[PDB]
Amino acid sequence: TXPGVTXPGV
Amino acid sequence: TXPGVTXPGV
DNA sequence: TTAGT
DNA sequence: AGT
DNA sequence: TAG
DNA sequence: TAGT
C-alpha cells in the first residue's frame, strides 16, 4: 500500500 | 519516523 | 510464488 | 525510506 | 506477520 | 543512539 501501508497496486 | 516516514524517536 | 516508504 |  |  |  501507499507507500507506506505502492497503491495498491503499483 | 512513523512508522513510516519510529517517531522519532521510538 | 505478486506487481510496487 | 525515515540530531 | 509490514503493507 | 534510537526504532511500517
Q: Which residue of A has its CA nearest to B5?
A: A4
- Residue A8's SS3 state is coil
From the CA of A8 to the C1' of F2: give the distance in Å.
31
Chain A residues at the B interface, defined by Cβ less than 8 Å, are: 2-5
CB under 8 A, 24+ apart: contacts of A5-10 = A5/B4
Measuring from the CA of residue B4 to each C1', which nucleotide is nearest?
F4
Cβ B5 vs Cβ A4: under 8 Å? yes
Secondary structure (H, E, C), chain B: CECCCCECCC
d(CA A7, CA A4): 9
Residue B9 phi, psi dihedral angles, 5° rounding: -100, -155
d(CA B10, CA B6): 5
Are B5 and A5 a contacting pair at CB < 8 A? no
d(CA A1, CA A4): 6
Resolution of this deposited model, Å? 2.0
Buried b or exposed e, range A1-10, using 16+ CB within 10 angstroms: eeeeeeeeee
* Grid coordinates given for B2: 512513523
Alpha-carbon Rg for chain B, nearest whole angstrom, is: 5
